[PDB]
Structures are given as structure tokens and as C-alpha cells.
Design a protein around this ligand. Structure first.
Ligand SMILES: O=C1C[C@@H](C(=O)N(c2ccc(-c3c[nH]c(=O)[nH]c3=O)cc2)c2cccc(Cl)c2)c2ccccc21
Ligand SMILES: O=C1C[C@@H](C(=O)N(c2ccc(-c3c[nH]c(=O)[nH]c3=O)cc2)c2cccc(Cl)c2)c2ccccc21
Ligand code: NA
Ligand code: NA
Ligand code: NA
Ligand code: NA
Lengths: 305, 305
């Protein structure tokens, strides 16, 4: 029993983290096989960040300008190329600690673990969701750039996120491992609008199911609803509209608890309309949306890597 | 910016986890140097758990009854001894992945990371506090026994917790690495009272400081208080009494924010008495007490391992 925001074990990623420097500040990179991946703004001075011409800035750099260090082991850079907002630095040594891995572009509302690093060294790990508006609410300081987000399935690390930037609003923006931003963002020091965000309905429901499994049952009521009715309420409270695809994804949890999805929706409806009246659920006084249906089953059934 | 419940990177501990079996069920052990540490109830059948005579049960076991496996690598057990509620299994091979490490008995109100494991394999990592009543609110299923709690400072893993038991109330109890329970608990399947618990005042204050650093400032008021006045309120709301030692520990955060400790106490007083009026702090609608003053500085200054 119990329910926590659990991250994946970070070891396999820890063995891939390096430091990359290219004339000024140091950031993190990710060493897989014989390639180091890092944010392209490693080549920028503080002044460059205002309006970088990355192509021009990169042209001034050579292989030998990239200093890459894995712990105290210097790596030798033998090629470099820019791909969207990332640099790929070819090194002469394959990382011996490379895990089985894939690059994945995740969907909004999905979750992942972040290994926050500074100077190529791991500081901490936490679980994040990709917000509907393609920001993440992380914990990042200057120099965390290049830290990655990931999931692990069986032996395989699916990298989905590289950290680039804190927006002026204090939320975080980054790319997939091919250097494509999530969301409308660009890598420069400008004010940039994030979408209006919404609450991830399917995740809140998953977390209500987790609560029931864990014995928190006070919010279960005698009402039901329809997808249409529920979605009126979802609209009013800035929740994502629920679809049959979401209902299908919730099937396992519905089966485990014996509580029909639309019955749980009616519980959620009542919580949205009446609040929690100073009660808690799973140690929270708000409706939590950073756990997927997969996350709940993973944790409530003890799957390992 | 941002503030998350951040765990330590788990890699150094992942390399120490093994599976231990001794006639029935498998649990986890911790392999350091040439010793494997695990819960002593690895020697118990389900029936034994009701009222185990551990000394008698252990006498029936020999070195060769302990099957220890590190991934797919069998270890050979060449001695065993019981120490309080743990077994120490001497193996013929020193773990090559042993980190610099210490065993520590932590204080109530301190925090640590838990590497939840099953069958000697890591499932996930999260941050926990030791409650004032010496329970932890974890996330554990059957077979998680032997999972450990730890802190990392520079290169050194301080093991402070080994998981033993879920109480009938759904909170968790365990030992230090010398096998001494935290709290009044014993390793048998009985109803056992935990103390009345309290909120960790010094941690709530630390987290209020974290909020200010992160820009959440609405709860700062024009009042101050005294330690004596504040402690009347602390009493009423089942908070730990604040001492000058706690004030001293909060000094750095007070200096960083320019907010005197007793001024922050007066903010806390007002929150306790009036609630949050449907607002949030650092994404929480309650007063959070699982971050130490050290935790806040660690995260807000980006210290690595
Ligand atoms: O989460 C983060 C990351 C970081 C952040 O956001 N950006 C950032 C700020 C400064 C530099 C920098 C460049 N060159 C130097 O020689 N010295 C520097 O210091 C690089 C990136 C940044 C700013 C705008 C655009 C982009 Cl793509 C990155 C940062 C700074 C403060 C707090 C949090 C964070
Ligand atoms: O967090 C936990 C750990 C676990 C839990 O609490 N206890 C536990 C339950 C069963 C066994 C067991 C022994 N021998 C077998 O052959 N098969 C078994 O299955 C061992 C320990 C336990 C119970 C009482 C006292 C002690 Cl010291 C340990 C457990 C079970 C269910 C849910 C959570 C947890
Ligand atoms: Na960039
Ligand atoms: Na997020
Ligand atoms: Na035990
Ligand atoms: Na706890």
C-alpha cells in the first residue's frame, strides 16, 4: 500500500551523463554509443542568447573547441553536426555504459522521470508530466541544460526529453532527442507564450482509482454520468475532454476496483463542483494529474527494470 | 526555478541490490563489500510471521539454504549471523560496485530516498520523511522487504533505512542497517500502535522559504510572533514545538530571503489559523513537511554527487 510520485531508477542514465563546454559555460550532454547529444546553445555567450544565429555561431567552432568530459575522462570529438536544436558530437570512444535505448517523442499528458544534472554530474531525480501546453513544471537552475527525461520498460531506456530553457514564467521547455521543441518554443531569451494549459482528466481519474486501491474511498458517491454530461463539467473547469480512448485506457483500473469509468467520472464531477471540503486524497488536497493509468498499475503491481 | 520532491540519483544503490531466498519467499538484500544485509524474516514461512522464534528458526538454516543472486550471478554464502532484526550473509565475493558508504541512524523529521525493489531489481525511487512517530509513508508491496533508504553526500551513500513491514494502518516500519527498528515496532504480524504523529514544523518553514525563493509570496504577512506565542499555535495544530536549534538551522534560508524566522512563523501561524482559502503554495493545497532546510538549499543551489 501507499502511493508516491515514483521516478524510475536513474542508474542507467547516470552512466550516460557528460559535461560539454564550447567556449563559455558548461552544460550536460548525453553519451550513447559514440555520440554526445547536447543543447545547441552550448556554443553561445550570454550575449548570444538574445538572438542567436546558430548556423553562423557554429561555423566559428571546430571539433577541438568542444570539450567533453565523462567524470575525469576526456573524450575526443571527431565530428559535430547540428540537428534542429541539438548538437551531435561524434567522439572516438563508444560509451561502455550505454544502455538499450530508444528516442521517443512523447504525447502531452504522458509522464517521465528527469535526472537533473549540473556539470555532467547527477543532482536528483523526479517525476514530471508533459503539460497539455507542452511545458513541464520542473526544478531546474542554470547549468541544468542537457538534463534528460526518460521512461524505462524492461531493459530499455526511452529518452523523451532534453532540457533547454526556463521561460520567464518559471516553467520549463525542451526538446525531443532529435532537437525538436515540445510546444511553440524557440531557443532564445525572449518572452514566449505557452498555450492555455488544462488538467489531464484521464490522469486524475487514474489517481482516483489509485486512491480507491489504497483505501481512500470517501469521494465515491451514488451518482453516475455520461461522457457528454461529464465533458460539460470538464469544459467549465478547464479539464481535457474525456474520450472513449481514455475510457478504454482506464479499463484495467475499472476492472480492478469494480468501479465503472462513468461512475468514477461522477465522483470527479462532484469533487470539481463541491471541492474537497478540507479533506485529502492520497495525501493531497487537490486533484492530482501527474499519474498516468500505466503509472498507477506499474506502482500498484511492483513492475521492475 | 521550481520545486519538486527530488530523490537522490539511485545508481550507486542499484548496484548493491540482490535477491535473497531462504526456503519460501524472496526478498531484497544489500550487498556491500563481502556482506549481504537483509530482513531476518527471510527465514519465515507465512505461518511463521504470526509469532516467529527467530533464534530457533535460524538454527534450522545453514549457509547453503541462503540463495543469493546478483542479477544472474549466484553468490556463495560462507557465513550468516543475525544482528537484531537483520541477517548478515557473508559471501565469498566482494561487490565490485560497492560505493563509499556509511550506516546512519537518522532522526525523526529527516528525509531520505527509497529505492523500491522486488526480486533484487529496482522498481522506482522516491523521497520519504521519517515521521515523528518513526513510521514512513511509503509505497511498498509484498516482496519490497529489504529495499533501503539513503542519502548521498559527495561520493558517500549513507544508508539509513531497510524496509521490513507494512502495519495494518497502511504505513511502513523498518530498521537501521544494524537491524534496530525505528519506533516501537517488532517484526511479526500483529497490530502495533504507532505514536500520535505530528507535523514537522521546521520542515514546513523550510518549504515556506522555498516558496518565497520560487516567487510564491502571497502568504507573507505584516505580523511577527515569538517562539512562545508560535508554540501555543503549534500545540493547538499538532505541530512539533520550534526550538532555537530549529531557528539556527533555518538561518541560511532566512538570510537568503531577508525574512526573519519569527516573521515566517507568523506567516505559518496565519496559515494554520485561517487555512489557505483555496490557494496553493508550490503546487500544494496543504502545508508540506517532507523537505528539510538542507533539502531546500540543496535543490535551490544545485549540489551534485
Ligand atoms: O532552466 C534553466 C536553463 C537556463 C536557461 O533557461 N537559459 C540559459 C541561460 C544562460 C545561459 C548561458 C549561455 N552562455 C554563457 O556563457 N553563460 C550562460 O549562463 C544558457 C542558457 C536559457 C535562456 C534562454 C533561452 C535558452 Cl534556450 C536557455 C536557466 C537560467 C536560470 C534559471 C533556470 C535556467
Ligand atoms: O511492505 C510490505 C512488506 C510485506 C509485509 O508487511 N510483511 C510480509 C508479509 C508476508 C511475508 C511472507 C513470508 N514468508 C513467505 O513464505 N511468504 C510471504 O509472503 C513476509 C513479510 C510483513 C508482515 C508482518 C511483519 C513483517 Cl516483519 C513483515 C507486505 C505485504 C503486503 C503489503 C505490503 C507489504
Ligand atoms: Na538550445
Ligand atoms: Na510537469
Ligand atoms: Na524482519
Ligand atoms: Na514519510
Amino acid at each position: 500500500s501507499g502511493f508516491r510520485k515514483m521516478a524510475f531508477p536513474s542508474g542507467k542514465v547516470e552512466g550516460c551523463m557528460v559535461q560539454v563546454t564550447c567556449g563559455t559555460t558548461t552544460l550536460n550532454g548525453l553519451w550513447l554509443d559514440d555520440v554526445v547529444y547536447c543543447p545547441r546553445h552550448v556554443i553561445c555567450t550570454s550575449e548570444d542568447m538574445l538572438n542567436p544565429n546558430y548556423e553562423d555561431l557554429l561555423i566559428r567552432k571546430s571539433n577541438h573547441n568542444f570539450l567533453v568530459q565523462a567524470g575525469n575522462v576526456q573524450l575526443r570529438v571527431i565530428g559535430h553536426s547540428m540537428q534542429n536544436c541539438v548538437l551531435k558530437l561524434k567522439v572516438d570512444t563508444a560509451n561502455p555504459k550505454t544502455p538499450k535505448y530508444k528516442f521517443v517523442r512523447i504525447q502531452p499528458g504522458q509522464t517521465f522521470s528527469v535526472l537533473a544534472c549540473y556539470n555532467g554530474s547527477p543532482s536528483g531525480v523526479y517525476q514530471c508530466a508533459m503539460r497539455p501546453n507542452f511545458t513541464i513544471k520542473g526544478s531546474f537552475l542554470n547549468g541544468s541544460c542537457g538534463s534528460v527525461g526518460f521512461n524505462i520498460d524492461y531493459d530499455c531506456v526511452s529518452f523523451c526529453y532534453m532540457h533547454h530553457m526556463e521561460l520567464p514564467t518559471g516553467v520549463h521547455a525542451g526538446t525531443d532527442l532529435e532537437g525538436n521543441f515540445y510546444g511553440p518554443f524557440v531557443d532564445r531569451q525572449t518572452a514566449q507564450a505557452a498555450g492555455t494549459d488544462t488538467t489531464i482528466t484521464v490522469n486524475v481519474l487514474a489517481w482516483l482509482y489509485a486512491a480507491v486501491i489504497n483505501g481512500d474511498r470517501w469521494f465515491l458517491n451514488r451518482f453516475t454520468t455520461t461522457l457528454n454530461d461529464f465533458n460539460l463539467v470538464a469544459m467549465k473547469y478547464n479539464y481535457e475532454p474525456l474520450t472513449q480512448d481514455h475510457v478504454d485506457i482506464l479499463g484495467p483500473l475499472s476492472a480492478q476496483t469494480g468501479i465503472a469509468v462513468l461512475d468514477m467520472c461522477a465522483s470527479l464531477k462532484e469533487l470539481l463542483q463541491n471541492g474537497m471540503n478540507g479533506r485529502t486524497i492520497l495525501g493531497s488536497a487537490l486533484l492530482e494529474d501527474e499519474f498516468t493509468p500505466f503509472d498507477v498499475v506499474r506502482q500498484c503491481s511492483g513492475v521492475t527494470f
